[model samples]
Target: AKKMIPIDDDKLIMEFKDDATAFDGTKKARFKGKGWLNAQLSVIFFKLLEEHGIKTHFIGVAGGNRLIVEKLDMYPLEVVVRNVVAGSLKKRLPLPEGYELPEPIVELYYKNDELHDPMINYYHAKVLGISLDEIKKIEEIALKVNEILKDYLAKKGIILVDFKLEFGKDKNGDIVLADEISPDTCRFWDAKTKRSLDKDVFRFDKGDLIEAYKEIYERITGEKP
Candidate 1:
């Protein structure tokens, strides 16, 4: 949401930034071509989802790291779905990484950068002005998205370990999926090798961010980024 700019009454422009952050921006770095890879990935994912009846904010690729999308009145929340035991969940629970979960784990977070995006319960979300019914609907949609992307990525030998999503109300006041789906918002692991192919590469300085993205691009689309 912070990366997007309003262009008109019905349209918006998303400008992907190369700046990457973790732990609420305390850890940061800039990598060239990062934004372009993410934006293109988003376009591909959005189009793929739309084909299967998922409503999204995406309109089309504009240029470079920019995208033209539908404008939405966004909810102040982050919807996260974890398909595997990893990242923050590994810290919260007494579980190790690479643990496979039986079902998708859906979570809600108050999207405040200053608060470090604290996890919130359903009641906590309601107090923060998120309707319970909307939250349930969001959970359903989030899980559906997980199923779709998980299967899509599997074909390319990529595991959708976990990911974040954002939602918003459209001009018609209908809640719909918003924001981008990219390596920055996802934890992609090589299905066979179990190697991190997404943001973890940048988060832990495992390898070149651009190279990792290029690898994902090639795997997903069978073309160079």
Candidate 2:
């Protein structure tokens, strides 16, 4: 995605950056080629999900670090789907670490980085003026996404530990998926040993960032970035 220029009425351009951040930008860094990697991952994931009957903003990759997506009136929320007890779930709640949840758990957060992205619930969404019907539809879409991604990653020997997703109304005012589905917005772990293969590597300073990213990229795409 590049600029505000109107190329096509239905098109939206995205310009990816090498800049990476965690914990609300409290930790940040620049990794060369990171943006292109994310773009590639997103393209793959979006296409795969689309083929499975999921609606998304992705139109196609526009080369390098750019993506040509459908313009959307984006939602102001992050719908997260989790499969294991980790990260904030383990820290904020009195939950056991490494607990394999029997099913995916859906959580919602008001997406205001300045407010530290506080967690919200269905009631909060209603209070903020979103209809209950819309809330339920979002939940339905989130779970379907989790189900598709979980199976997709499982076959690649990766675990979709959890991930954040965003949705929006397309030009037709229909709810459609938005945002990237790369390691940045998701937690990916090696299926067996549970070694982190996602942003956690850089966030926690586990090892060479590029190596971790490349490993998972190769596993998922069966090609080099």
Candidate 3:
């Protein structure tokens, strides 16, 4: 995959792709202009998070679909924060798909494709060589992100049902958020209609994926992409 290219010892250029995948890349397709939209959306969110004192690896924009970001030693985990029950949670729990949780739930999955990124716990992370202190700190960051994004999305009439995050250690050995934040990594629902405004639209064929993505961009930025 040519998605990322090293620009220097401390920076990498990430080129977002129009291609989309689900079910561990079993299903795939491409949407025109998706890369540009996702790149811009991630920039908006990373900037917002940084303004709120959440450290991230975002540096600046490159081209339409590319981002220049600080290079980090990434962890092999995917941290998911959920506000409303949806996706795999429904399959494992008895809760209805859209039911809001009394509190946000943070879960960890090992970032291994061969293992299908199976859900794991702190103990599992320990076995994976991550210190408990690091795990705890990452969880704290994930929860803070949920609070910030949930409140922000609510104001835009969108529900931040859930989202995934990745973290990595920077040159200073400080853990910083290190992945894109866009419809692809988030589950946004229209507040009034409870309709999918994220990747779920493409995953389940709810409607036009680009249209849904554009709607999210418009809702968040108050402008058409």
Q: Taking the tens digit of each residue's C-alpha lDDT, what string does model 2 give over 1-225?
A: 223334587887777788878876789998888888888888889998999999999887677788888878877899999998989888765779778898888988998868888899889988877778988999999999899999989999998889999999986778999888888899988988889888898899987777777878899878877
Go through the candidates in order and give the clash count of each. 0, 3, 0
lDDT of 3 at 143: 95
lDDT of 3: 0.92
Local lDDT at 106 for model 1: 95
TM-scores of all models? 0.95, 0.93, 0.97
Report lDDT per candidate.
0.89, 0.85, 0.92
Any runs in candidate 2 off by more than 4 Å, and if so which?
1-9
What is the C-alpha lDDT profile of model 1 across 34-108, one tens digit per residue?
889899999989998999899999898778899999998899989999989998898787878989898899989
Choose 1 or 2, whichever is better by lDDT: 1
The TM-score of candidate 3 is 0.97
> RMSD (Cα, Å) of candidate 2?
1.9
Q: What are the runs in model 1 whose C-alpha is more than 4 Å off? A: none
Off by over 4 Å in 3: none
Q: For candidate 1, what is the lDDT?
A: 0.89
Q: Candidate 3 clash total?
A: 0
Model 1 Cα displacement at 87 (Å)?
1.2
True-structure Cα RMSD, model 3: 1.2
How accurate locally is residue 97 in candidate 2, as Cα lDDT from 0 to 100?
74
